[PDB]
Enzyme design. Structure first.
Site, PDB file in Angstrom:
ATOM      1  N   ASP A 125      36.586  11.026  16.536  1.00 47.55           N
ATOM      2  CA  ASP A 125      36.290   9.755  15.758  1.00 47.55           C
ATOM      3  C   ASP A 125      36.704  10.077  14.472  1.00 47.55           C
ATOM      4  O   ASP A 125      37.114   8.878  13.635  1.00 47.55           O
ATOM      5  CB  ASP A 125      34.711   9.339  15.747  1.00 47.55           C
ATOM      6  CG  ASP A 125      34.224   8.772  17.186  1.00 47.55           C
ATOM      7  OD1 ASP A 125      35.380   8.080  17.733  1.00 47.55           O
ATOM      8  OD2 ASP A 125      33.366   8.683  17.536  1.00 47.55           O
ATOM      9  N   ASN A 175      32.714   2.109   9.735  1.00 52.47           N
ATOM     10  CA  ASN A 175      31.551   2.771  10.340  1.00 52.47           C
ATOM     11  C   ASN A 175      30.339   2.167   9.339  1.00 52.47           C
ATOM     12  O   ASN A 175      29.741   1.185   9.567  1.00 52.47           O
ATOM     13  CB  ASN A 175      31.302   3.988  10.307  1.00 52.47           C
ATOM     14  CG  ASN A 175      31.652   4.674  11.456  1.00 52.47           C
ATOM     15  OD1 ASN A 175      31.752   4.025  12.637  1.00 52.47           O
ATOM     16  ND2 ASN A 175      31.688   6.120  11.723  1.00 52.47           N
ATOM     17  N   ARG A 222      13.135   2.568  -4.149  1.00 46.85           N
ATOM     18  CA  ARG A 222      13.237   3.741  -4.755  1.00 46.85           C
ATOM     19  C   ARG A 222      13.199   4.923  -3.519  1.00 46.85           C
ATOM     20  O   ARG A 222      12.173   4.692  -2.485  1.00 46.85           O
ATOM     21  CB  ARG A 222      12.079   3.930  -5.665  1.00 46.85           C
ATOM     22  CG  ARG A 222      11.940   5.520  -6.335  1.00 46.85           C
ATOM     23  CD  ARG A 222      10.756   5.310  -7.293  1.00 46.85           C
ATOM     24  NE  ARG A 222      10.690   6.447  -8.076  1.00 46.85           N
ATOM     25  CZ  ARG A 222      11.109   6.690  -9.143  1.00 46.85           C
ATOM     26  NH1 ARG A 222      11.856   5.444  -9.844  1.00 46.85           N
ATOM     27  NH2 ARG A 222      10.945   7.806  -9.739  1.00 46.85           N
ATOM     28  N   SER A 275      29.850  -1.628  14.997  1.00 48.32           N
ATOM     29  CA  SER A 275      30.523  -0.659  15.885  1.00 48.32           C
ATOM     30  C   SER A 275      29.985   0.716  15.050  1.00 48.32           C
ATOM     31  O   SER A 275      29.903   1.795  15.497  1.00 48.32           O
ATOM     32  CB  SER A 275      32.165  -0.450  15.920  1.00 48.32           C
ATOM     33  OG  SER A 275      32.572  -0.370  14.553  1.00 48.32           O
ATOM     34  N   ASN A 309      23.851   4.891  11.051  1.00 44.59           N
ATOM     35  CA  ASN A 309      22.750   4.068  11.060  1.00 44.59           C
ATOM     36  C   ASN A 309      21.810   4.322  12.064  1.00 44.59           C
ATOM     37  O   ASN A 309      20.469   4.012  12.123  1.00 44.59           O
ATOM     38  CB  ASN A 309      23.336   2.385  11.447  1.00 44.59           C
ATOM     39  CG  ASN A 309      22.566   1.394  11.836  1.00 44.59           C
ATOM     40  OD1 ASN A 309      21.961   0.675  11.028  1.00 44.59           O
ATOM     41  ND2 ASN A 309      22.214   1.353  13.155  1.00 44.59           N
ATOM     42  N   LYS A 310      22.383   4.713  13.433  1.00 45.97           N
ATOM     43  CA  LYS A 310      21.391   5.214  14.321  1.00 45.97           C
ATOM     44  C   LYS A 310      20.372   6.200  14.127  1.00 45.97           C
ATOM     45  O   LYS A 310      19.193   6.203  14.288  1.00 45.97           O
ATOM     46  CB  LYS A 310      22.026   5.731  15.665  1.00 45.97           C
ATOM     47  CG  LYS A 310      21.274   5.870  16.727  1.00 45.97           C
ATOM     48  CD  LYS A 310      22.192   6.243  18.033  1.00 45.97           C
ATOM     49  CE  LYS A 310      21.304   6.262  19.296  1.00 45.97           C
ATOM     50  NZ  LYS A 310      20.455   7.769  19.142  1.00 45.97           N
ATOM     51  N   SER A 311      21.034   7.038  13.001  1.00 48.57           N
ATOM     52  CA  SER A 311      20.096   8.347  12.864  1.00 48.57           C
ATOM     53  C   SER A 311      18.838   7.785  11.905  1.00 48.57           C
ATOM     54  O   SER A 311      18.013   8.524  11.651  1.00 48.57           O
ATOM     55  CB  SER A 311      20.956   9.336  12.073  1.00 48.57           C
ATOM     56  OG  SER A 311      21.732   9.914  13.148  1.00 48.57           O
ATOM     57  N   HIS A 325      34.173   8.407   5.982  1.00 50.79           N
ATOM     58  CA  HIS A 325      34.197   9.744   5.751  1.00 50.79           C
ATOM     59  C   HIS A 325      34.219  10.196   4.279  1.00 50.79           C
ATOM     60  O   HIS A 325      33.939  11.148   3.961  1.00 50.79           O
ATOM     61  CB  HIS A 325      35.113  10.619   6.718  1.00 50.79           C
ATOM     62  CG  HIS A 325      34.998  11.988   6.451  1.00 50.79           C
ATOM     63  ND1 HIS A 325      35.687  12.809   5.425  1.00 50.79           N
ATOM     64  CD2 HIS A 325      34.430  12.984   7.284  1.00 50.79           C
ATOM     65  CE1 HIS A 325      35.469  13.980   5.436  1.00 50.79           C
ATOM     66  NE2 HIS A 325      34.708  14.086   6.743  1.00 50.79           N
TER      67      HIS A 325
END
Ligand code: V2Y
Ligand code: V2Y
Ligand code: V2Y
Ligand code: V2Y
Lengths: 263, 263, 263, 263
Positions: A45, A122, A148, A158, A164-166, A223
């Site tokens: 990816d 991403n 804050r 996507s 985002n998931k973490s 990245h």
């Protein structure tokens, strides 16, 4: 058509790239890494994200394809064993395209620096330059909260399976034209209050982050991470631009989610 | 036009209702609780949900309005002090309508019970009839996960600030045509695996819950909760039907979120 | 006794400090900021943490007291209006002491740098020097997980209401001799796996973080954050040392929690 | 010594039980399921919990051992292949004991029902009898919060890897004498406020749940769930009683956690 192939640069990926080039030579397919119509990424990816950003100024004229030479990627979603079939089907063309939404990030400065825009596949994130991260969050010109904490993350559809998931965000099917804001470690007590929950915004909504005291921020787009100075505003909105994928079979998003996180 | 007014039934709400009826009598406005064009709810969000379900068979012919006689509601979003202005503006009509998406729930049974459909404005949830809740989660006919836990919640966009929020779901602007699935206390270990994250689905995606052993489930739709027996399948999809609100000023969703959860 | 007073340095805190010094002059109380027996901090929790670290080499000989001139602090838990009563009761002494556990952090380097130890009252955290944070987590010499994410936080009991809380950690009564590890944004997918849950460790358990590739880390101890280079190991354990508070009335921890986060 | 063996009742577990009884017959070991000194459970964690509750009135006189004939259990932590070695080592005795803390739950009623106490090895939970669950949470006689939601869970240390974990609670080493309270889906908005975070309490702290309107609750203790009527108070505290395990080798808790959730 014009095509190019980017490689992760390990042995496996470089050899696959040379072999696909040889196979393309057996068709009416010209290698051109300046104006390709097809951009094939071989690696993971991260390789695919670098391909996207290499060609982000010609997105409407390119169909992207990702091959994963390691584990399955969400963009690098085809196996090396299917490379010959990929060559055969791209050369003949006449394939369908699939489009995913993108995130537009605008960074405005004090005088002397002109504003800059960035496109994300991403997400874009903002963190402090050291010390507490404090911004006012303004949604369509309405002051929503004073955040804050450690930082904020604004994800494409996507992108929702990535950072985002973490952060606790929802996974959203990429046909939804939206962006999603998640918190990183907000403080909440008698003085400070944030919503907590991820927030999902449709097209044409604008989320503006405005500094309170410190004006230096570490801003990431996919990245890439850069320290931005004398920042006056960071604006997020769903882009009008879209990334286009070549698809040669059904590999549904929810099956990719299942394959990556469940089994 | 034909209108009706439902009351929470406390003193405050009943008196406001009688006073609004008197004010409507000063215009060309007929009280009809069989075929109203306008349905005004006075009380709280629960009152408003009961009004919605009282008239769910005539949704395309009704504009709903909610007045909160307690604290601000997400549907009951107008103050009692503005009731006279509400009367004046509804009677003259010519107001704009705002539409929110709805959730369609289908429950299929073994033979002897015909399938049943329900419409939700907030959410539909499923919990066991006692003991562990275990269903296979199937998304567009693709087996996604086996969920073992306390239950599952499928929320509309405007429902995302309700149960969904307490379960960790994202808040989504209600112009997005989507539904959102959240977990209640899934077990995850060497044997059992779920996605964890909330999942956001667009229109035309179908999420099917299929029993594994026990076939009795407690199914809720908004405020209503019924024990369903010999269930073969529970299907969720974004409804084709929409609820229509009368709006007489700007009260943006994100400002309602701010007003309810931030300050 | 010997005492000293540290101030946040705003007008309010400096004036309160001078007034308390004047009041102490009316007793047998000598100002000594080299070997105090009493250390009074006036300001906020940050002021109190700086007082703790100023005197961390004489912790067994000092009773700390915190006055909050802003909002209530978890360490700065006495009001300015009670300063005269504080003076009266400290001067006469004969008060009880309360002790909270501390966190010992050991950082070991490659050759040329000797190991360093740090004591924390709130927490110690570790984040990367740029890019992904990857460490092996080893608990009492047993390889527990490979963590890939933004960072890790190891909190004392009284620290659990601070950063730890924002990371999802449990709040623990400070009479429990323990430390608590929380994650910051771990990735979890087919390749990477962490426990997710906060972990609570008793005295004599040692948690060792060992680098995998990158060896530079940003290590924080309470308010202080330093980039550490050529790190071989970071070891956490509950300290044998304790911080001692003077208490002159009951202000229970759970009431402080209630007062700070609930109402 | 006197011993007994409880079986899950499937073929595998029953055969292992008969074979272990035959092996014990080769030593000075008497089968007695009235006053055993050794209680061996064969099956899973549910089997082990039923063994614990069968003998909860003689806990100080019993050493428990669990064999898992399915996947590894946190209490059923020995493999069937080691049954002969287990027989050999229990018969000779002289083994060390390990003790885990327990949870005491007291339920007080209106007049006509005497109070009842229950001991838990995993947890005790409280949920409504239908509709919203609302209790005042009182900690050592101090009103801490009004909880409105789905329910509450109070876990032992060894219970923290069970329901508690699914609710977001911390995992705590079972040598810590504590209990941990987690929320199930609390509502939080302008009217309602809870702490959110799990709360960890030491010995001698008492947490009292007091009803606000509805007085019927579904109370669970480990696997058992009963609807309790006319409840006036539910009190949680760490028990003075402890469960004792026979251990014949090192199988550290954190390694059991790793083995069950990581790899
Ligand atoms: N280069 C690194 O190592 C960054 C990193 C930093 C910290 C912790 C982990 C990593 C990480 O390992 N990265 C790659 C793995 O991400 C998968 N991947 C990628 C991508 C990409 C390339 O890298 C950049 C992206 O990294 C993410 N990221 C940043 N911080 C975090 C974080 N704390 N937790 C989780 N993800 C984070 C953020 O989305 C960036 O755009 N896209 C996706 C996708 N749409 N869906 C599912 N998986 C994805 C990819 O296949 C790998 O499995
Ligand atoms: N009657 C009860 O008491 C139910 C309840 C049970 C347990 C715990 C709390 C309550 C609760 O107090 N209910 C009402 C409060 O919900 C606000 N409200 C309502 C609504 C409605 C009427 O009730 C039915 C709804 O209740 C919800 N619900 C069910 N369980 C939970 C839970 N565990 N946590 C959080 N919400 C839950 C679920 O969405 C149902 O459709 N809509 C919304 C909305 N779109 N946005 C923001 N706030 C909303 C409303 O204004 C009040 O402030
Ligand atoms: N100087 C800053 O601004 C740091 C900061 C950074 C990012 C976001 C917020 C802040 C923050 O505002 N700090 C102070 C507020 O923390 C209260 N406080 C402090 C303390 C202290 C002094 O500062 C250092 C501490 O800051 C924390 N911290 C670091 N990052 C985070 C984060 N992401 N979220 C939440 N807390 C974080 C971390 O525990 C450090 O030891 N102790 C406690 C305590 N035992 N219990 C309850 N409240 C506490 C204090 O009374 C204030 O209300
Ligand atoms: N009989 C059922 O099926 C109950 C259940 C209901 C809903 C969802 C899942 C299950 C479940 O599958 N149960 C057993 C699995 O739990 C492992 N286990 C057990 C135990 C036990 C026997 O059952 C009773 C216990 O069940 C738990 N429980 C109740 N609700 C939930 C929930 N929502 N999520 C997660 N756990 C829940 C709650 O702690 C009860 O005391 N102890 C432990 C432990 N100390 N550490 C690690 N794993 C454990 C055991 O080895 C299995 O792997």
């Amino acid at each position: 058509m014009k095509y190019m192939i980017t490689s992760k640069g390990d042995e496996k990926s470089d050899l696959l790239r040379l072999n696909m080039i040889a196979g393309f030579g057996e068709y009416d397919m010209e290698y051109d890494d300046v104006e390709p119509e097809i951009v094939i990424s071989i690696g993971g990816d991260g390789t695919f994200l670098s391909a996207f950003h290499q060609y982000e100024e010609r997105l409407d004229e390119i169909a992207f394809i990702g091959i994963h030479t390691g584990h399955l990627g969400f963009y690098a979603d085809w196996r090396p064993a299917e490379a010959d079939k990929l060559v055969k089907l791209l050369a003949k063309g006449e394939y369908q395209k699939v489009s995913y939404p993108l995130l537009k990030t605008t960074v405005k400065y004090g005088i002397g620096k002109k504003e800059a825009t960035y496109l994300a596949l991403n997400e874009s994130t903002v963190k402090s330059s050291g010390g507490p991260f404090v911004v006012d969050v303004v949604i369509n010109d309405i002051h929503f909260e004073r955040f804050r904490g450690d930082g904020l993350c604004m994800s494409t559809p996507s992108g929702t399976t990535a950072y985002n998931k973490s952060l606790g965000g929802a996974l959203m099917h990429p046909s939804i034209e939206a962006m999603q804001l998640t918190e990183m470690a907000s403080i909440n007590n008698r003085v400070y209050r944030t919503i907590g929950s991820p927030l999902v915004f449709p097209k044409h909504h604008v989320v503006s982050l405005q500094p309170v005291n410190d004006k230096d921020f570490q801003i990431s787009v996919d990245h890439l991470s850069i320290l931005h100075r004398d920042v006056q505003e960071i604006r997020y909105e769903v882009s009008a631009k879209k990334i286009h994928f070549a698809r040669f079979r059904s590999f549904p998003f929810w099956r990719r989610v299942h394959d990556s996180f469940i089994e």
